[PDB]
Amino acid sequence: KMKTHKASAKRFRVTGKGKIVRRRAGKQHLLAKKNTKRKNRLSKLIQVDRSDYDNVIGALPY
Amino acid sequence: MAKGKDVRVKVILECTGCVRKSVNKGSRGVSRYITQKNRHNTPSRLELRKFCPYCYKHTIHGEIK
Amino acid sequence: IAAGQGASCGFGMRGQKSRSGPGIMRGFEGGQMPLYRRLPKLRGIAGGMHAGLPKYVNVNLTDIENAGFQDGEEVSLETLKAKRVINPSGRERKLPLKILADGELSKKLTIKAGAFSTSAKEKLEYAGCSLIVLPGRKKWVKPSVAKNLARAEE
Amino acid sequence: AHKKGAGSTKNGRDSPGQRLGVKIYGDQVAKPGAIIVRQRGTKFHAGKNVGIGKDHTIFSLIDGLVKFEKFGPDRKKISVYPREIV
RNA sequence: UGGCCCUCGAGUGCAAAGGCAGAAGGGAGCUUGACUGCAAGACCCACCCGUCGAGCAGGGACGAAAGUCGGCCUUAGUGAUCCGACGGUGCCGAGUGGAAGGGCCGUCGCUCAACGGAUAAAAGUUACUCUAGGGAUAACAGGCUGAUCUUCCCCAAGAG
RNA sequence: GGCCAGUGAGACGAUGGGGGAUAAGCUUCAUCGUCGAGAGGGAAACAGCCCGGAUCACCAGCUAAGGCCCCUAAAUGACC
RNA sequence: AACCCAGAGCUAGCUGGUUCUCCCCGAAAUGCGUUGAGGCGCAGCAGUUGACUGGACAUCUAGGGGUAAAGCACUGUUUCG
RNA sequence: AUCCCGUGUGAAUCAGCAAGGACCACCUUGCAAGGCUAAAUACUCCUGGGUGACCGAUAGCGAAGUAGUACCGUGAGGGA
RNA sequence: AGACAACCUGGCGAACUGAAACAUCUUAGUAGCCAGAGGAAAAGAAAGCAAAAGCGAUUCCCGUAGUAGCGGCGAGCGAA
Numbered sequence: 001k002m003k004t005h006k007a008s009a010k011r012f013r014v015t016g017k018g019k020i021v022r023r024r025a026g027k028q029h030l031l032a033k034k035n036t037k038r039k040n041r042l043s044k045l046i047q048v049d050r051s052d053y054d055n056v057i058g059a060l061p062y
Numbered sequence: 063m064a065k066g067k068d069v070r071v072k073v074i075l076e077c078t079g080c081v082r083k084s085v086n087k088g089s090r091g092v093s094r095y096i097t098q099k100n101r102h103n104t105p106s107r108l109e110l111r112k113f114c115p116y117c118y119k120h121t122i123h124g125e126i127k
Numbered sequence: 128i129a130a131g132q133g134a135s136c137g138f139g140m141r142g143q144k145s146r147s148g149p150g151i152m153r154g155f156e157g158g159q160m161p162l163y164r165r166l167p168k169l170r171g172i173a174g175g176m177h178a179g180l181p182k183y184v185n186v187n188l189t190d191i192e193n194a195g196f197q198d199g200e201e202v203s204l205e206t207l208k209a210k211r212v213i214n215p216s217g218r219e220r221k222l223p224l225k226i227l228a229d230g231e232l233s234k235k236l237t238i239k240a241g242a243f244s245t246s247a248k249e250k251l252e253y254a255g256c257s258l259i260v261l262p263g264r265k266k267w268v269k270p271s272v273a274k275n276l277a278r279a280e281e
Numbered sequence: 282a283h284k285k286g287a288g289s290t291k292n293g294r295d296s297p298g299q300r301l302g303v304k305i306y307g308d309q310v311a312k313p314g315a316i317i318v319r320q321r322g323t324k325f326h327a328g329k330n331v332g333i334g335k336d337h338t339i340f341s342l343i344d345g346l347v348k349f350e351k352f353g354p355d356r357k358k359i360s361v362y363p364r365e366i367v
Numbered sequence: 368u369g370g371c372c373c374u375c376g377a378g379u380g381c382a383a384a385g386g387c388a389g390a391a392g393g394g395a396g397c398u399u400g401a402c403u404g405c406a407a408g409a410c411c412c413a414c415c416c417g418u419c420g421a422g423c424a425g426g427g428a429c430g431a432a433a434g435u436c437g438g439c440c441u442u443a444g445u446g447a448u449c450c451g452a453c454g455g456u457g458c459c460g461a462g463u464g465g466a467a468g469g470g471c472c473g474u475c476g477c478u479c480a481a482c483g484g485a486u487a488a489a490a491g492u493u494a495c496u497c498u499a500g501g502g503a504u505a506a507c508a509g510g511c512u513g514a515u516c517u518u519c520c521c522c523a524a525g526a527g
Numbered sequence: 528g529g530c531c532a533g534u535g536a537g538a539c540g541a542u543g544g545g546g547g548a549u550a551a552g553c554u555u556c557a558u559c560g561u562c563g564a565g566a567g568g569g570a571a572a573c574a575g576c577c578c579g580g581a582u583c584a585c586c587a588g589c590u591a592a593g594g595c596c597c598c599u600a601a602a603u604g605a606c607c
Numbered sequence: 608a609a610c611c612c613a614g615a616g617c618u619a620g621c622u623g624g625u626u627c628u629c630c631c632c633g634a635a636a637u638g639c640g641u642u643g644a645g646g647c648g649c650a651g652c653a654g655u656u657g658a659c660u661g662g663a664c665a666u667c668u669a670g671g672g673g674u675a676a677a678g679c680a681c682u683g684u685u686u687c688g
Numbered sequence: 689a690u691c692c693c694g695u696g697u698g699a700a701u702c703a704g705c706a707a708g709g710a711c712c713a714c715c716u717u718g719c720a721a722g723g724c725u726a727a728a729u730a731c732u733c734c735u736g737g738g739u740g741a742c743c744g745a746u747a748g749c750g751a752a753g754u755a756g757u758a759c760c761g762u763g764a765g766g767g768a
Numbered sequence: 769a770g771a772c773a774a775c776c777u778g779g780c781g782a783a784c785u786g787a788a789a790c791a792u793c794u795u796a797g798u799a800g801c802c803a804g805a806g807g808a809a810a811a812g813a814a815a816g817c818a819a820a821a822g823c824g825a826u827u828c829c830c831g832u833a834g835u836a837g838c839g840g841c842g843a844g845c846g847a848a
Contacts, residue, residue, distance in 0.1 A: 001834065002834080003834070003844080003845080003846090004834070004835090005160070006837095006838095006839095006841080006844090006845095006846095007161060007165070007168075007839095007841065007842070007843090008160070008161070008165075009171065009835095010168060010171040010172050010841080011165070011166070011168040011170070011171040011172075012170075012171060013170060013171055021170075022166055022170070022415095023166075023167065023169055023170035024167070024415095024416090025166050025167045025415060025416065025447065025448095026167065026415095026416080026446090026447060027167060027169065028167050028168075028169045028447090028448085029473080029474065029475080030473085030474075031446095031447080031474090031475080031476085032445085032446080032447090033074075033097055033474095033475095034096070034097040034401090036401080036437075036438075037402090037403095037437055039473090040403085040404075040405075041405090041406090044170060047414075047415090048413095048414080049413065049414065049649065049650065050164065050413075050414055050415090050648085050649055050650090051414095052529090052649095053160065053164075053648085053649085054160070054164065057160055060834085061835085067478080074474095074475085076474085083454080083455070084455075084472095084473090085403075085473085086454090086473080086474090087453075087454060087455085087473055087474045087475085088453075088454055088455090089452070089453035089454065089474075089475075090452070090453065090475090091452080091453090091474090091475055091476080092452090092453065092454080092473085092474045092475050093473095093474050093475065094473085094474075095403095095473055095474075096401080096402090097474075097475095098401085111399060111401090112399080112427085112428095113399095113400095113402075113403095114400090114402055114403060114425090114426060114427075115403085116403080116455095118426080119402090119403080119425065119426035119427075120402090120426060120427055130531095134625090134626075135625055135626075136625085136626040136627065137626085137627060137628075138627080138628070138629085140625070140626080141625075142624080142625060143625075144625095145532085145533070145534090146533075146534095147533080147534070147646095148620080148621080148622085148645080148646085149620060149646070149647070150620060150646090150647095150788095151619090151620095152619090155620070155647095155788075156647095156648095156788090157620075157646070157647040157648060157788085158641085158646090158647050158648035158649090158788090159648090159788075159842090159843090160648085161842065161843085162448090162483090162485080162641095162842085163414090163415090163483065163640075163641075163648070163649090164414085164415090164648085164649090165447095165448065165842090166414090166415060166416095166447080166448085167415095167447065167448070168448075168449090169471095172469090172470080172841095173459095173469080173470055173471090174458080174459055174460075174468090174469045174470040174471095175459090175469085175470090175835095175836065175837090176459075177459070177460075177461060181832095219832090282478055282480075283478080283480085284480095294442095295411095296411090296442085297410095297411075298672090299410095299672085300670090300671060300672070301409080301410070303669085303670055303671070304669060304670045304671080305668085305669050305670080306669095309408060309409075310407075310408045310409080310420085310421075311408060311409040311410075312408090312409055312410055312419065312420080314671085314672095315409095315410065315418095315419080316385090316672090317385080317386090317441065317442075318410090318411095318418055318419065318441070318442075319418085319419070319440085319441050319442085320419065320420090320441095321419095321420095322419090322420065322421060324421080330386080331671095336670075336671090339669090342408080343407080343408085343421075343422090344408090344420085344421045344422085345408095345420095345421090346408090346409075346410090346419065346420060346421085349386085349440085349441085350385070350386040350387080350440090350441085351385085351386075352671090
């Protein structure tokens, strides 16, 4: 029963093992002109270290 | 346009395939998937290059006459 | 039991404030979590599926039809289930659907209310329905549904 | 905006420029050395563009990745102790 | 122009280091992978992020062929988030069937440089000053140090 | 890998280099050790130098550094 | 630009103080960013818990980067003849 | 969107109209422009009984003994 | 008229502070000022909601989600 961080929930999505699979960056419409075979290597990876504070935020939202 | 610190603009155009679509965008100020950049000032006009779009492979491409 | 709080007296004489000088008052989250950590958001922001989805998983894990009112001993799955039910009370979603899982299958069976997939067609064919993949050579038109399950109306 | 006036250069740098793995080792298909990026492909360690004498490794692992100018490019295949059973 | 000595001491788009004449040097014809979808195995960062990469799938160009090319010798030529324009995609679209909108694929707008960028948008004084702290941040001064300054001394052309 | 931290203006000596006159326990980096979060013995008195790095008692011995005329224990010991 | 009361026990990454006892181990004052550098976040360093012939000193074999030194054909300087 | 409005105007009116978080068609439901209506629900000066691992006159309400008096300020007010 | 203790309806209406800056926002439509009535007020049997299954006065309590949605979609607030 605590104010769950929304702007954070609309970003990350707890996979299953409690990992925070955060999509790549600079991918959203790119906005960085051409990237040549770069925008293709952009999918969804996992965060490390800092992830020990990004998951605690949305502890309730799971 | 005259180059310099005043009013510049990246001369970036597109190259849509003949009577086709995909691998290219069509709007007011948008660039294709390959994002081509012409010279404008330098003797150019009428660009085209056979590229491989979505539907089938290899076509014509090159919009803006 | 009591790590040593209750006050601050004892050994080493604690002084709180991390013994340096940050935020003596709790709540002062140094360095907001949003900025510097708010990477490009796209995967999350969506349109939100209309389906209420009161349960991440399907109706259950293949437990329909069982001695008792936990399934209505008629294989229907509506909202009168106890042992295994979509919700403690039931009736609050849309489409049922289910797959295989743990459990010694089911002696009696008469699957209904949609549902399909080999998961509940080849394993739950001992009674009620069975696995039937409508071929694509019979009709000249595109394949008719990926998997068609008999006895399940619509 | 862009600044101008009496002043010297600035800003430090770091490629970096080191060497991954070395002679006689299970050099996997990673990238040994690589003092400079854009290093072409090489199905072995290296051994060229330097004093007389070619280098060789005891074990290989399907292609690799070494510099284009120094150490390389690609020529003969080297792999002591044939990686085969029986 | 011709002959001889013709040896990174030339030429590489632009700074510089390294490298290069098996040439990316230079010229010409054909062309235009300045390819789509992926990609074992790794480098570089706290993280974000950045870089390289054989091979595979769907189609082409050059050469007889092997075979190369996923940009430009390499390293900079740049900048996320959010709000939005527009195309495609029957994904969704809260009575239904559509639609608006949203989602997804693709691209565009910000000397946002104080450029990991707090605003869409914001310059100064305060000898009227006030408050929270410290000499880890100055002024007088002690101390360390002390080129300069003061004093003395060495060799010594000369003035006398 | 997981739970709770603390700390980001440190100083000094030896050694290898930028700043200053290779002037400063001055300042800015790398490395080792100490202080800083460990006394004590010695340099008269000087935390950072040297030896050695303290569970405790003990009118118990032998040593390190540094010394051995007296003052605070210990050679005005031998030979040139 | 007040007096008194009330929200304001406001705010105060500022400063000061912070009250029993024993045992074991043991820090740092650095990097990357920050209108950020007497603030902190992540990482490095510390403690606890649960899995791993995982590591360290030394010898030998097996390479490269190339300081000191030296040299100084080349690049940038250099006196006598 | 809808509901309540300042201002300028202002249709239909029950084989008619509104609502269904743009709009439109269909379907369904409901039809306000005037008003009343117990109980469940809130709090307390004060009354009676009782309870409390609440405190005990530097405690607790400022006031458990004729103090929010005696005193301070013009006063509000502050306040043993 | 009680110069009315709280609760309740209505009119008007901040800042400090939070947003580690601050004019949006949030923080408070709280505090505070004023008017009226009851001991309950307010609201209340529904041009509702849902839906083509049906429920069906208002209010209150526990859930449904502190999800969805809204927002320099930042802080923060927060449905049905």
